[PDB]
Structures are given as structure tokens and as C-alpha cells.
Design an enzyme around this catalytic site. Structure first.
Site, PDB file in Angstrom:
ATOM      1  N   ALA A 128      16.712 106.830  13.198  1.00  0.00           N
ATOM      2  CA  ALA A 128      16.930 105.983  14.343  1.00  0.00           C
ATOM      3  C   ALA A 128      15.627 105.416  14.940  1.00  0.00           C
ATOM      4  O   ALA A 128      15.655 104.417  15.579  1.00  0.00           O
ATOM      5  CB  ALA A 128      17.666 106.744  15.418  1.00  0.00           C
ATOM      6  N   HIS A 129      14.539 106.121  14.750  1.00  0.00           N
ATOM      7  CA  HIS A 129      13.306 105.693  15.392  1.00  0.00           C
ATOM      8  C   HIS A 129      12.737 104.529  14.666  1.00  0.00           C
ATOM      9  O   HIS A 129      11.879 103.849  15.184  1.00  0.00           O
ATOM     10  CB  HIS A 129      12.302 106.818  15.501  1.00  0.00           C
ATOM     11  CG  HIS A 129      12.680 107.882  16.464  1.00  0.00           C
ATOM     12  ND1 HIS A 129      12.625 109.212  16.154  1.00  0.00           N
ATOM     13  CD2 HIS A 129      13.084 107.812  17.739  1.00  0.00           C
ATOM     14  CE1 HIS A 129      13.019 109.917  17.183  1.00  0.00           C
ATOM     15  NE2 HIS A 129      13.287 109.097  18.166  1.00  0.00           N
TER      16      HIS A 129
END
Ligand SMILES: [Cl-]
Length: 99
Positions: free
Chosen positions: A91-92
Site C-alpha cells: 500500500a505504501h
């Protein structure tokens, strides 16, 4: 049902039960989530609280994301009762404009 995979490791696990292509600690959670996605008739059926189901945005509009562990996500398109382009993603690595 799940019809296609972008991530080969997910595909290998789903198809063959072979775990070499995903983190070993994530195997049980990934199996459970893949089964849920494969069974769902509607995106809304994947909205268990712990999954943190949400649509992505921008170039990823049309994709959906559910949580496995920490920053790791299973992402997919969902349409007419099937799931496509299954991927396992961090997600980052998504920009603010994409979530
Ligand atoms: Cl495929």
C-alpha cells in the site's frame, strides 16, 4: 470466481497450493481471502470489517483492495460476479492520488 492473476505467486498458491511465491507467514490469510473473493457474487460481500475493503482511485479506479497484513493488500477488479487481475501489493507504494 477468480478468473485471472497479475501476481504469479498468488496464482501459484491458488492453483497449486504451492507457497514459494508469497511470504510464508501470509499463506493462511491469503488462502482465506482468495477463497472469499472467489466465492463472492457482489463486491459488497467482501466488506468484512477486518478486510478494510476500499476502491482505489486515479489510474487504479476500477480496482479494489483488501488487507492481508500491515501494508500488504490483495487487489483486484470485480465485475459481474467475477474477480480479475489479482495482485499482492504494498500500500505504501500507492500515491496519495491513488487511494
Ligand atoms: Cl491468469
Amino acid at each position: 470466481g477468480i478468473k485471472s492473476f497479475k501476481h504469479k505467486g498468488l496464482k501459484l498458491l491458488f492453483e497449486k497450493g504451492v507457497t514459494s511465491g508469497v511470504p510464508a507467514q501470509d499463506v493462511d490469510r491469503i488462502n482465506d481471502r482468495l477463497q472469499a473473493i472467489d466465492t463472492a457474487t457482489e463486491i459488497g460481500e467482501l466488506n468484512r470489517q477486518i478486510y478494510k475493503l476500499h476502491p482505489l482511485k486515479g489510474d487504479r479506479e476500477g480496482y479494489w483492495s483488501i488487507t492481508v497484513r500491515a501494508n500488504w493488500r490483495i487487489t483486484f477488479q470485480f465485475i459481474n460476479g467475477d474477480a480479475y487481475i489479482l495482485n499482492y501489493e504494498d500500500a505504501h507504494k500507492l500515491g496519495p492520488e491513488q487511494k
